[PDB]
Design a protein around this ligand. Structure first.
Ligand SMILES: CCOc1cccc2c1[B@-]1(O[C@@H]3[C@H](O1)[C@@H](COP(=O)([O-])[O-])O[C@H]3n1cnc3c(N)ncnc31)O[C@@H]2CN
Length: 190
């Protein structure tokens, strides 16, 4: 795997991924609801024209995050075995320099990895399900499947990924970690 940093657009969010090769397909970030950085990253107001599905029916991001934390406490083991809320803020994808929205969602566990993920709906079914429910971008970076039907999780050839294009998944993993290390923004990790 790898750890990588995403800068807040307006603070670094460290993610753990077993698919660093898919970085050019990371279209949003998800933090555990209990993640220490959430309160820091919560915007004062919603952006104009925000998708209502993203707001949990809250008037402000802070109210929505408080309500989400309170609501998920009413879940039992039954429910725990896709919902979430936009923080109103963005991080920068270090591969493409693009802003990506930051969410909390209870599908991300606080005490595992770094407690935060990069979301790649094209290639992780959990992220595909979330993106379909919320109306988030789904981008193909590994050719081999059909992202309109389901996340493609297998080996393939890199597309839409600049200096990774044409590489196999194993080659792209090595190349992107090299790039992250040269930039000081990530590391390979067991
Ligand atoms: C397992 C397939 O993962 C895939 C497959 C395709 C693409 C990806 C990933 B992967 O999601 C992260 C991390 O890598 C992966 C680490 O899981 P393992 O090995 O520790 O069991 O799980 C996800 N993960 C990491 N931390 C957490 C967490 N705290 N809570 C929930 N899921 C997490 O990154 C990309 C975008 N999602």
């Amino acid at each position: 795997g790898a750890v990588a940093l995403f800068s807040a657009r307006a603070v670094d969010i460290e993610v753990f991924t077993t698919r660093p090769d898919t970085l050019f397909g990371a279209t949003y970030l998800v933090l555990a609801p209990e993640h220490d950085l959430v309160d820091e990253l919560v915007a004062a107001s919603w952006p104009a024209g925000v998708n209502p599905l993203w707001t949990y029916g809250g008037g402000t991001p802070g109210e929505a995050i408080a309500a989400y934390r309170r609501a998920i406490a009413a879940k039992s083991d039954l429910e725990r075995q896709k919902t979430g809320v936009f923080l109103g803020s963005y991080a920068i994808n270090p591969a493409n320099g693009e802003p990506v929205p930051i969410f909390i969602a209870d599908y991300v566990l606080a005490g595992y990895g770094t407690g935060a993920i990069m979301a790649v709906p094209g290639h992780d079914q959990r992220d595909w399900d979330f993106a379909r429910a919320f109306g988030l971008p789904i981008v193909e970076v590994i050719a081999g499947g059909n992202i309109s039907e389901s996340a493609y999780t297998g080996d393939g050839i890199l597309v839409n990924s600049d200096y990774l294009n044409g590489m196999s998944v194993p080659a792209a993993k090595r190349a992107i970690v090299d790039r992250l290390e040269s930039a000081g923004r990530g590391r390979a990790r067991i």
